Amino acid sequence: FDSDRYRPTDTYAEVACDKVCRAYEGLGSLLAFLRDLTDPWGELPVGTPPEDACWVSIDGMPLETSVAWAGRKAGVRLSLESPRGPAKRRMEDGMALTRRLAGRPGVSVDPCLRVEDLFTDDDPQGYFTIAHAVAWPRYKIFLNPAVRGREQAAARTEEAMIRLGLEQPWRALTEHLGGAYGPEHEPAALAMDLVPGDDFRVQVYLAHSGVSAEAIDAKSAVAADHVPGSFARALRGINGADDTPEWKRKPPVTAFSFGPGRAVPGATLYVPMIPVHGSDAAARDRVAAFLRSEGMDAVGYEAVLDAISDRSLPESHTQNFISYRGGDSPRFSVYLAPGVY
């Protein structure tokens, strides 16, 4: 525990509330909602870190704040994962939360419940099983295809894709990638928007170990929204040399998005921040320079960083990823550890 902003007795839910409010401030009762949402661990004091770091945040907190720009608008999102242990109890906490979201105003958890058995187990492996996010409310769930080892990740992902009706765009991706999944494009996570109908989306996050910016770009050429070279230019550009130990320890990620009635996936690039960059200030300078050269809003990005961060940025290590899509309908997001641990 290491905070100038929070006392050790502040609760997880109170930190969550504070971060969400400050993110809105940077963009220019909630507490009640979040206590309920994080029931019952949301009441735990933040001063006592979990036994096992949460996957959801690079500082191991059970909370991660996100701000997303798209279609000339910005929105705040919050990711959550139980800090409880051991892994099986953490998993069951998440299962419980999914079921508590069912029947919330616009929610559909049916697609999640039809593949849930694939990403849960009585003896789970890997650094997580279940996590969620809320956006302002729509919800999503994150699942670990490596719950029973990495070697089964592609198979488990594929079977879920099939159950969900998305075999065709999943086939398109799989063939584009050469027909097999390896460390070059490894299924590291799945997400689902818990909504019914055409707006339903599943994202498959592929990690890219030991490949160049150009090769990563080319893996996206099957995407509905592929802008040739744009991923290569973001990666080379923001993150420079691909041979640093820090690059190799946290490789880039592409989120492929799948929707009903869509023959091919969309693609969004996830650019690792800390620890590829030495601090949030260094990462900020380079991300801002890239945003400007793309004509995107670097001021709003920096305003959010400033509003939400608890330490001066050269001493702050809270940016996990930024995400980026170029072209006519550009997207940018930043994902932030609370920076409490």
Residue numbers in the entry: 36 to 63, 71 to 178, 184 to 388
What do the authors of the reporting publication say about this deposited model?
Heterologous expression in Streptomyces lividans TK21 and an in vivo analysis revealed that TleC catalyses the ‘reverse' prenylation of the cyclic dipeptide (−)-indolactam V (1) at the C-7 position of the indole ring with geranyl pyrophosphate (GPP) (C10) to produce lyngbyatoxin A (2), with the C19R configuration, as in the case of LtxC15. MpnD also catalyses the ‘reverse' prenylation of 1 at the C-7 position, with DMAPP (C5) to yield pendolmycin (3). The overall structures of TleC and MpnD adopt the ABBA-fold, which consists of ten antiparallel β-strands assembled into a circular β-barrel, surrounded by a ring of solvent-exposed α-helices, as observed in the structures of indole PTs and aromatic PTs222324252627. In contrast to typical indole PTs that exhibit broad substrate specificities towards the prenyl acceptors but with strict specificities towards the prenyl donors, it is remarkable that the indolactam-specific TleC and MpnD exhibited unusually relaxed substrate specificities towards the prenyl donors and accepted different chain lengths (from C5 to C25) of prenyl pyrophosphate in vitro.
